[model samples]
Target: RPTLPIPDLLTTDARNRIQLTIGAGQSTFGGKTATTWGYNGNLLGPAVKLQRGKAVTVDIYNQLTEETTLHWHGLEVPGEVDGGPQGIIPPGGKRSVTLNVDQPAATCWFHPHQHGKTGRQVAMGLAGLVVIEDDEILKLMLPKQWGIDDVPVIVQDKKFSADGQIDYQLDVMTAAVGWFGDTLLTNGAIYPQHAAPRGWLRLRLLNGCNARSLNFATSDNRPLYVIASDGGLLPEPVKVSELPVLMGERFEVLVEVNDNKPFDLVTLPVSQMGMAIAPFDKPHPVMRIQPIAISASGALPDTLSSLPALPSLEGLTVRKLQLSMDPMLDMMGMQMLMEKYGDQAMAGMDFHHANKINGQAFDMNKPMFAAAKGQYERWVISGVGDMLLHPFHIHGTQFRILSENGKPPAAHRAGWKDTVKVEGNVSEVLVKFNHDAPKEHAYMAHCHLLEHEDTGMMLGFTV
Candidate 1:
């Protein structure tokens, strides 16, 4: 069994906060000691549970050799304390921020957000879970047990050197298709068997992989009930056979762990994962699980939570965003056949090198898009070349996918989402701003594929 991090009980005290220390160290991976960077120790940090409306603070100390910034992903905090690259914590330096907790209960996270270094920092280590609870959610009859019926599964795939070090062997081609690792890990455990409860399970799934998306499903192709997306819980539970959770996104799934038989949380095939046509050998279970005897059986309410309906968009500004790329690629016989068939073209291309939004890369100094505080806008994001999947993510606020490929969005994605997988022909979303995100302290939007994001597939916008 792999060692797990410790989490504390939530209290009403606003001052109920935690201190974090970040630095480099060594850990045993693949039976060898290797360098790793993590939140508290060198491997990974523990989860921080907070009560809504109770103010929380995080005092961060950077003991690492280089600069680092802790970004609270999926948290709707003020832009100034959002932990962007601007709020860098130099070596031996410190930074602290408070959380007002204006949002609802959700499974957010903290990670390093320094430009260019985000991938390596996260790959080596440095990430943790933030579980915010509220009175409304506490009343619900859902699994609240931290590591029993409810669990946080932070999954990532990585490659290790012979000496068990993080092998970051990248090239132009690797950047084109995300740097995919061969070994899969959950909570820093390799090939682990996650213990399950007897009945219903509320799993908090975070796709912490640097580039790849999580095409999650049951080993038997059974449907899984998805209760929450990136930002918060959905209006209700939506059942689906498969859910494509992109990088940097989070999902809360409810599964029936009955029968006491082994089941699995597996990733679909490569074609479904949006890649070239080489299918995987078999569905390797990320977490092989089986439920045993327990007290509770299973229960699921019809309505999970009440959500605000889509506001009026009659007077909202509509923008067009085209995801394009330069340093064009030439897939042997692939581009030719794709260009001929049109829609079939992008289906086979690995177009990641130097990505962009609206033909421009990220410019911290100059924001390509600007919006007023509390502005509402609908963006129609489409692709230029072939059929590649771009998991688009917005940093400041969560958005709603209005439609995809000119039709209503799938049930799983038709909720408050901070990351949307842009696939097929085109996708459109409704976005808004709460606080004044000006150029001086703007928010970010980008492709969640870490390599593409680091390469320039990201941009900042001011409200």
Candidate 2:
């Protein structure tokens, strides 16, 4: 097995400056060179480390042929710098934005968010990880050495063309339910292996897949100690045998390296109300973990962090956002779009454009609603008329999952989150935005499945 490639680290300077360049790159997977896009490097960008209580100026340079936007996914920044569709950086263009890091320690990510082209851009490999640290996180006894004991496991599935290029073409079924590739890429490598020191190995896992919801497990079914959610650390580590990570969701899991035995970290069958396609329905190896007996490790503390009390919903309104996919309406919309765009529409189908929320497709000129700053709102995200699951992601704010299918969330989900997996059931969350989002540069709430957001299952709102 090939060694896992650790991404370069970019730490914020004393002046709080982080630079990123979005450009074209290439990587060889299984002896085939596939053209891809990335930030700062080939395939994926570097892991950025930002400290809490500090403001950072992120300077992004666009070197790609087309326009792109670098969205700080799961970051609680202002809308202007949240890198929504409005923040487009044309080819050869550069932009700088400053944001205050007011959130706790978490494993967030950055990716392209350029409206209709987000799926294509992301599929072509434009993504990276963001590591936020605080005083509480510094006190943890977990692995802290980057690229050694602490590792970044960004998992994505991709398809390659015969000519060694990324196959981003969409079809009716793929567009409708979102794309699912056959090959799994962890940290942009196939059959990758990581040598873990004899201790606790911290895997900062991010389900960067476009549509596939990954159920991760060890070969021998070891317990994955989930320490953090999308937004921050949990009250304590939650032990689970199988971990289901939805699109755009991040989790910090600790794996104990007790023996020198090697085990494969694989994704179990994904048959849970989502795109349960062929190969995706079977077990696939994500990465190989080979343990090394170098140094012994200590036990973890009982408590990790003390989370704040959630806001009361006594006088708050419960906003109902429905995620619906009508095959008939989708076909009708595709028929009209085909007539308008000719063969190009079918070749690069946007069938998901017909998918809608609240019975309406996404309109750039429209704003779904407005939210008051610092006010908590209960949002009920429901998936209707389908067995598929939609991972609902909200921008500019980290929300707490109140309930899922009328039941309290699991232990791993009992923390601040920016995304929730919504199966043909209702998932309620209490969201509050501390930043201001004007009408011009509004925040967005949408299905984290990149194709779904590119199509129509998205809405914009101001704070």
Candidate 3:
């Protein structure tokens, strides 16, 4: 196992920053080399570090033979700079986005956001972490220094073809069921092992896998204290023996080693009763932890940063969307819309499927809802078919899950969140549009199930 690399620091000033050219092709890795579509070097891009309340600009030069766009997964930037599919940087072209880090500090990420190619692009290694820092988060007595007390762990599962190459092609069955890989990689390394001091260690874990859902816990089944979720720090630490993290979800966990002993970060597959596929029915160790002796080490912090209060839903605009998996309705709707709206509708349907927001499928060039700048709003997402859980993610802002099917939310969800899992019935989220918005700014709201988002289960909003 290879040691994880520390994140590379990128300056906040747009002019001083370097330009990133992303292209599709093969690259060398570990001397042996592998085929990958990347940004800087090998498979994955460099981790970008920024500070809160600062504006950072990235000039994404898309050298890919096809179209692609960069989506800042959790940044609270204006819609125009959110980099949804609508902001596609065509082949041989470029697009610039300025991200103003006004939201609470957290571990976020960036990835390609092409309309029907997100899953393939991300799975092929077009992703990287972005860490945002703030005074409040820095004041916490927790791990703050990178490569020492704090670490970023990107967890992903990869499937290899018969020729030992990373595979991204998905058949219709796999597309509907979702993709899964036999090999798990952490921070771009397989079966990574970490050496830690005999004390509390903080890990920012991102579930970047294409389709796999992980029920994470220690090998000894010890409860891990969760200090934060996707968006930022929770109101308080929550202890859980097992936490199920879906694709695009993130969690900050603090684990304490009482003695110089070894431990493992393990993933328990979905049980037979809850299993979605028969082939992925085994528990496996994802990463190992080797604890070493330290000189009377530091203790865990009593308090972490407090999350900002979410905007009230009262007096705010509300929008509801329903997602489903019925192909017949989708095809029929596409044909009807094509006839009614002419060639433009047909083109829009070609890039999407039957997944709808308020009874209409997604149109990449169309905005789902438009709001005035600095408006507070509530968005309700409901699943109409398949009874599957969809991890809903918003591009530019963090919100609070108000309820799940009219019931109170889970304990871990009582904090700022950029992603929420909507079950079969309904899930409600409250958001505030306080970030600066240009006249034509746009952002995205989509299912974090990468394949679904690629196929049509995504939509864009503007303010």
Candidate 4:
């Protein structure tokens, strides 16, 4: 096995308003020197840090030949700075995106949101962590050293060609479900090894894959002390041995370790919704950790951080969304429907909308699920797909899963979240399409599986 590359620590500007020149980079991940995208360096970019309630400006410099959109995955910024499909920076051009980080302390991320190429762009690289800290996070007892015990575990799966290059060729089956690769990586390293001192190590685990979900646990079945989630800190720590991390979800957990022997951060084989996926069903190790010594060890705290009480559902507007698939129409039939409907059918890629939301494919010109800004709304998001479950992700803000399958959300999902798994049945969430949403520049909600989103499992809405 080759030596694992050292995980790079991303530093930020000391001033409140900071700017960075970020874009393409070339690197070798699977024993080949191929073009990979990231904000940090040759591999994944650095973890972007921002203070909650402070305004920040980001400069997007797209050096790639084609146009791409840079999105701050969970940040609640103005529509112009949200970096959705509307904010495409042409090749060799730069766009200055500004935002006011008026959100809670949480671990969000930044990535490309361009239509058809999102999966490929993310798979190749071009993703990084965005962590916002407030007085809440400062009061918690956790690891703070970046790249030390406090590590960024960005897990991604990829397939490499015989020539040691990334191969993203996808067929209908792959696209209908989502792309899955043979190899698993952590922090941009293949079969990587890390040395953590015997103690508690806080890991910011991000499911950076395009489609697949991860059941993250340890080879020894050590308890995973979950501290935070997609939106922000949980009211209290949840103790669990394994966590089922859906696509595009993020989890922060403290691993209690010792210097006794070597252990591996492993994931059990996963099924695609109700469908079984090969090479994924078998358990796989992501990183080999050798606890050299107790560099930093502490007793696990009973409680982590406090969260605001969930909003009452009394008199709250209720909206139901059904996620289903199309009739699996061929190219000509799709075109025929579009030709007959004229502008009513939407444009460009709506013809390939095998995945549908509320029986309709996504269209930029159309708006779905309009709500009053700042008013709490209960969205009953149900999945019509029986054999497949999709991770539903929303842009611009985070919400709470009030109930999943009519039952309360799991311990890990009881907190603020921007993405939730919508499968088998309905997942009810309390969403407030609050400030920042405008009539002209609205936000989007879609399936987190990049492939599914690109196909049509997305919808735009205005508050």
- Give the top-scoring candidate (TM-score): 2
Every model's TM-score: 0.89, 0.93, 0.87, 0.90
Model 4 scores a C-alpha lDDT of: 0.75
Question: Model 2: clashing residue pairs?
Answer: none
Across residues 1-463, which tens digit of lDDT does each residue of candidate 3 receive?
Answer: 6666555655545364556789766643333456787777556676788788776778889887889888788877766777777677989998877666787778888888877788988888888888888888776667655765577878887777766577776444344545566667777777678777767888888888876677788998767889888888887788888877878988888887656568888877653112322234555777788776773234456666655655555687778878776575444433553454455322211324645555565676677777556666778888856555578887677778887655766778678788877756788888766654433446777888776676677776766
- What are the lDDT figures for the candidates, one per model? 0.74, 0.83, 0.71, 0.75
Over 325-389, each residue of candidate 4 has an lDDT whose tens digit, in order, gives 65563344335534544443332113357777887888776778577778788888888555465
Off by over 4 Å in 1: 1-16, 272-281, 329-353
> In model 4, where is the ten-residue run with the lowest total lDDT?
342-351
Question: Which regions of candidate 4 are displaced past 4 Å?
Answer: 1-22, 273-278, 297-299, 329-351
RMSD of each: 4.2, 4.7, 7.1, 6.4
| CA lDDT, candidate 1, residue 404 | 66
Residue 407 deviation, candidate 2, in Å?
Answer: 2.3
Query: C-alpha displacement of 246 in model 1, angstroms?
Result: 1.2
In terms of lDDT, model 3 sits at: 0.71
Q: How many residue pairs clash in each candidate?
A: 4, 0, 4, 5
Ordered list by lDDT, greatest first: 2, 4, 1, 3
